[PDB]
Design a protein around this ligand. Sequence first.
Ligand SMILES: Nc1ncnc2c1ncn2[C@@H]1O[C@H](CSCC[C@H](N)C(=O)O)[C@@H](O)[C@H]1O
Ligand SMILES: Nc1ncnc2c1ncn2[C@@H]1O[C@H](CSCC[C@H](N)C(=O)O)[C@@H](O)[C@H]1O
Ligand SMILES: Nc1ncnc2c1ncn2[C@@H]1O[C@H](CSCC[C@H](N)C(=O)O)[C@@H](O)[C@H]1O
Ligand SMILES: Nc1ncnc2c1ncn2[C@@H]1O[C@H](CSCC[C@H](N)C(=O)O)[C@@H](O)[C@H]1O
Lengths: 201, 201, 201, 201
Amino acid sequence: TLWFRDTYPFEVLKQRVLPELIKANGGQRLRIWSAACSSGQEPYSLSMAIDEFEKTNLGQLKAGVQIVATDLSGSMLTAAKAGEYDTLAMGRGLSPERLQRYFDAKGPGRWAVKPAIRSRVEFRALNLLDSYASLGKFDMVFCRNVLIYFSAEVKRDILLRIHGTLKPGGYLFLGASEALNNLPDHYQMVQCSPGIIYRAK
Amino acid sequence: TLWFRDTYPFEVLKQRVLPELIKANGGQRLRIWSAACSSGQEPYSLSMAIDEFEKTNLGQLKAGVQIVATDLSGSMLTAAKAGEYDTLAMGRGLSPERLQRYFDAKGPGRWAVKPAIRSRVEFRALNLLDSYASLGKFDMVFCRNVLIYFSAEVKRDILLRIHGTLKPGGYLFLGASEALNNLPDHYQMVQCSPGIIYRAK
Amino acid sequence: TLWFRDTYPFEVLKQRVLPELIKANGGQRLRIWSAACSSGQEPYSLSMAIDEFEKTNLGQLKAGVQIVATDLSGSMLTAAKAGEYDTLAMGRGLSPERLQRYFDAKGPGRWAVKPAIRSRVEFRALNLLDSYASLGKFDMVFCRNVLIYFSAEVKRDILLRIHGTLKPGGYLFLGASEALNNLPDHYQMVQCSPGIIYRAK
Amino acid sequence: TLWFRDTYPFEVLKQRVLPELIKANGGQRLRIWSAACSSGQEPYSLSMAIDEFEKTNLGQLKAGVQIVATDLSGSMLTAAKAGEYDTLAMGRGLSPERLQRYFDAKGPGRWAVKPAIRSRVEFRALNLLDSYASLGKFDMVFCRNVLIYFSAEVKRDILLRIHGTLKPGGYLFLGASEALNNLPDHYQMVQCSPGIIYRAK
Ligand SMILES: Nc1ncnc2c1ncn2[C@@H]1O[C@H](CSCC[C@H](N)C(=O)O)[C@@H](O)[C@H]1O
Ligand SMILES: Nc1ncnc2c1ncn2[C@@H]1O[C@H](CSCC[C@H](N)C(=O)O)[C@@H](O)[C@H]1O
Ligand SMILES: Nc1ncnc2c1ncn2[C@@H]1O[C@H](CSCC[C@H](N)C(=O)O)[C@@H](O)[C@H]1O
Ligand SMILES: Nc1ncnc2c1ncn2[C@@H]1O[C@H](CSCC[C@H](N)C(=O)O)[C@@H](O)[C@H]1O
């Protein structure tokens, strides 16, 4: 994993998706699910992106954005919760501007997300083969580079149940080279130039 | 068995069956029979569906609904009235709104149906090959995915004796793939889009 | 159901099956499964037959016989456990000698099987559709007039799994008008004149 | 999952695999990996089968057997460590002899695997996608009914890295309906009649 992986998912979030969802709900609270969050780079990247949007658009989001980040419980999810990273992890995909604006040095070779970035993310233990019903409803779901490991039938079952967590017209973000197969009545492919997102029908 | 199996019967119940039965009986007390209740998923799904109709149609049900769930009494019957279900039993069929409104999160990997939903259900021991005279009269009978195990002659006799327990105009719900042939003087087919239910003539 | 139903199955047990099974195992413990025992007439008849064999052939049974009686849990299995019967049930198929030797009067119009006969019979709640592993191994299985109620697919699966409970060379007794005809690798029909039994291959 | 699933893999272990490996290592310590142990039925069945082997082969195993049971972290892995099972779980695949010899009755409808059987099993949380280096070397690996969840490329990688955990000539047990077909340099299929296992080349 790395920070702001592929660049354009987070630009699309700020430029395209957020203004559309805010216009419909009157700026009320939005919820984002970061599925298989690994060591936390993706959910914290989402948190920084929302912070950047909120600062440039005073004040379109009236209630903020909740990020729910999930993975299997253990030491990897535990470190994500701690929000600390070593130098090697911090040099992959993070501009120097974001490093100084959003992280605190500890600590020789240790950096931690700033409290405003940390507070948007709640980490929960969740197996993707289990039920998603405890997670609630989401305006956006990020499920990137995890579906690749499963069989075609299990991948379809996960995508179908992800659809049950999305509000209608919400968006699913997959990995850059991941296709969404055999659910033509559940997801609409949307071109972002660059990038592809999938609207929940 | 699973929660809200096949989706359509519990929506057809709230949108077509209940308004008709209320009209036919003046909104008075209704009785539902869940035959072959298995581990309790079906009768509790009925109770939840009754709760949902009540909130959207306040005052229409004047005295509530009583649910009688029967099966071959045994460890399975005992676990049904306990109302406890592990991670696998809660895995499929429960929307996020239903899991939060009708269940209690117990310990790790254990959930319990709320007592307000459990109250509507009463469990008894009853073999489908025995008499039903002790059960009383029902406006609705759920007898799903149990008739497949018997001979055509036993299946017809069960469906005929179920007619004896149904109030005139009462409704019978079978499995989504089960047929009700060979009984034209007793059951009227009601296509619902999607699914098929049967009215006692 | 009735006492010593069809008569000759219990004579074949005493004259033909017991001497063969006792000779091979040296008179050690025998186990008999009475599947679908109903109100108990069949297992108690078997226990009476064993007692008649034990007092006729002293002392070829050196370890006694265990009878496991199963049916669906309810007022017909609970009636069998008590071993009490009314005049109507006592008047069908019971000789006067067996009535005097094996029953106690229990008030007007009530009779009870003697404790010496009931002691051999253990009653267990068991659906024929569930697994049989907890039952152990049997030298004989009586499964009479219950398979008729099921579909062809369920009947064959029950018969196949019954074979898994039988010791090789053990015997299966069906109802007087029942047969099996699609398990050639598992059972061998044995003419008894009159009636038939099935040897477990 | 269930106790002694498919029956014959555990008989093959006692009759063929254990004696061959004992001669293949001189009776020293054996290690078994139960991968994807789920609620623990499989590793506890293995520990029971080893006990049954030890009661027949008078201490032909010099320094005992270690069983390592792994699965994803969650409620099911935590239930396995406890070793307690309800009536429904105890009623599938367990003979009356094994119930008495290897379980202690607890609460009403509750049984627990005896400490003599649990002590041989160590439970660890492990994603099969992660490295196996910390597990050491095994004479036998049970990886049953889990490979079907993954892509063809992940399945081959998992089986390839399982070979890295196996001692030369060690045995791999898959599910009854599973096979590997693209690792000709690493695995040799062994026919057992019935069923199949694989030997590490
Ligand atoms: N069954 C499962 N349930 C939940 N998470 C799983 C899983 N199997 C694998 N994963 C997780 O999926 C992650 C894929 S790494 C991808 C991280 C992030 N989404 C990104 O795009 O950079 C791993 O961290 C792994 O822990
Ligand atoms: N003779 C009989 N009398 C009562 N119940 C029976 C029965 N034979 C089988 N059953 C029950 O019927 C159930 C079928 S599973 C069906 C459960 C539920 N009706 C659903 O559709 O989801 C089994 O659990 C079994 O316990
Ligand atoms: N699924 C099932 N599992 C176990 N018993 C069942 C069953 N379905 C029906 N039965 C039982 O089978 C019995 C048939 S009456 C037969 C009784 C006795 N074997 C005789 O020949 O006279 C009934 O008492 C009924 O309770
Ligand atoms: N990525 C993964 N790593 C480890 N275990 C996994 C896994 N994905 C699924 N599993 C586990 O694989 C199990 C399959 S059920 C199989 C249990 C047992 N081996 C038997 O044959 O009966 C499930 O318990 C599931 O938790």
